[PDB]
Amino acid sequence: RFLKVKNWETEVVLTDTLHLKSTLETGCTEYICMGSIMHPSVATKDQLFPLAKEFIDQYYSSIKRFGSKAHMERLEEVNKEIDTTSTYQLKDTELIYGAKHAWRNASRCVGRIQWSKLQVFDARDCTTAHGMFNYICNHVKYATNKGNLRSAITIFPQRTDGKHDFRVWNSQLIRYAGYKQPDGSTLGDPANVQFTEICIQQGWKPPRGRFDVLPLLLQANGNDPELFQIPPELVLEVPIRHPKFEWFKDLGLKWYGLPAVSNMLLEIGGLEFSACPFSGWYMGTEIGVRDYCDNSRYNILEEVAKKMNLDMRKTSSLWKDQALVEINIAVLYSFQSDKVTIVDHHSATESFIKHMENEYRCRGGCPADWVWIVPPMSGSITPVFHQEMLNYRLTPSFEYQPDPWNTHVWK
């Protein structure tokens, strides 16, 4: 059936037909909704050809050549390859199409208005961690672009038997280390304490500061991962200051400009690309709300509210909320003053609404996860708050995968 979604502020009603094309499961049933569960829970030739066919069919449908000679010949070509090798290889055009569409279908991403403007770097000829490092450096340098950030993805060889996976062990290409202190607390980013310890265990000499860029830990063809230092001139960073509080710079805060997810899995036509780092540019709340103010992260709200001299004895003074806004003002101001691309959550959500209208027009829908699309601060003064959304799983897609250290047979 056709499904209607309404915006309760503008009263715009959109009609969704795209969800009829999905066949992956969401985790909900008719009796339990799992829409706020973070992760609700190697292929044979037998499963692989229907997945390949489905993808080839939508690729040739997208280029207005469904049922053509090229389409029929590609299907037969892919059929032979799965027969004789138990897998197949994507053409370059298919790889680009598949990566852009995995972004387009990412229901949790508020940034998808940009989806067709993705730079795709084919790294499927890589064989070693040294080659991986070269490809990643080129990605970072291209995507950073001296502050004028550009979306990019680098795609390393697909999974074969599951014993020869390419993996970026880092969760993001650029991240700060976290140090569990003798006296029990944490120096740096507490989210990275375990990864930091693996790097130390693997030989990384930690500088033991608050903003130490972690090395890359790179695994090629299932071998033991290897450490590499990203050349510092490639790592663009922004000192955080505030347009009114001159004391803010004294907090010593900074952040990196490039957000680059390096631990997800990219699935296209049944093939699994277990190393596929991709990067865009920040929405300010990703830094200033979650990275700085989550209790299990940098957790600086107390320090800032102290310097603002707010009454912190009772929660109903909203001292946390006041400090939070100023921290996010500082972040946006700092990036903008350094001419590093950043979007505030008002502009981002506004763009997402326009993106939804576009997708409902041209595509018949847009899968969207309200729990993730709505920003972590000031939710209801953004237009996504009042937007009904339908969440459903289309492919190509990005998926989570287990951490490599929980799997890796060390050698």
Added chain:
Amino acid sequence: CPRFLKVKNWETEVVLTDTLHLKSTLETGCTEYICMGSIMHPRPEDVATKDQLFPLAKEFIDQYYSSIKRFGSKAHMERLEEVNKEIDTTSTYQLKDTELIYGAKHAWRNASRCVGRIQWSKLQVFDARDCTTAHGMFNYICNHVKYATNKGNLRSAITIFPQRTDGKHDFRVWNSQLIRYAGYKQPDGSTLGDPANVQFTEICIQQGWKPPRGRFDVLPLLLQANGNDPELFQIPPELVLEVPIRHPKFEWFKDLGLKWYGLPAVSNMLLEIGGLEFSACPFSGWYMGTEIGVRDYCDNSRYNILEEVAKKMNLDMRKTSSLWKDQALVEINIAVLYSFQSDKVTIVDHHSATESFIKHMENEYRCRGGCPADWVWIVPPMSGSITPVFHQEMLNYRLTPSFEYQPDPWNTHVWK
């Protein structure tokens, strides 16, 4: 369905095990292939047949006798038999007072969208099932308001009018809440008062209400008894506790002339207990500050005063990346909380409410086997991620007794 479901809190690492979802009875709207958790609402003549009513009543009676540790008892089987004979001969049945009280508390306890449920067992239940006229409804509602307000020391309460029979004799409160301000559409397109209430205000005016046409005009009650045409009543102003909104630091905030009423009282929902339908069941609690300060004032299609506050704050309103809206939103919520506490009118901030909700949820998982919760509604509309519910995985499912939405009565009423 799997027998255990685990939810995790990603900030504290606490993992909870849900088995209560095995008792869920009605649909969520989701399927295996689509989630509808952000959809707001996923014939009146049609009432439950005898055959539909028997098992719903037995399910409720069993749950009631299990709750008082008398399951399988003589009284339990006799109650089952008495209900079964009532449905047989009259096509309906009547709840005992104990059952009605148990049912109302559990509809609250089961309300997945309610962050205030740590209080569910303290609900004061007023039995108004002997009411026959709109004048009597007005009497019951006034008594409810006065009891719940309690001079600012608010107490949660519900008043339950007679259940639906054939669907042509419904009791209804046409107001969506017992206390709301009027909204007036002007010829030039602007709105005075509360823009959410323009349509209901117009209904009242057509029914004979003479509107004073101000910014904070309490709407009259529009009350329907026994399926008759609804009738207008004015709540005595001394029963409507109001709070003038001022700010602890900004002396100019009082000059905005704002105020709000103290008692939030939903009156358009349907209470379903054991297959019986109570179409008029107004219930009241106390406010979370953000329900006034974020939504009632800063929603664009509401009072929309972020502009005027930002102007008096002399904020850079040119670019959104100044976060002038976020900054004004906080100050308004500071003023609302300060104004209620100063006048000693019960209110709860979103930090305290969400923290209490996490403790309630943990207790319910331990004592009851789960706690249905709707993340989209439980997370507050400002500062979501600095409250503990943001990081709490939740399972949503529908248990009975429950509060349900029902159609607006002006769309279905057959005018006499």
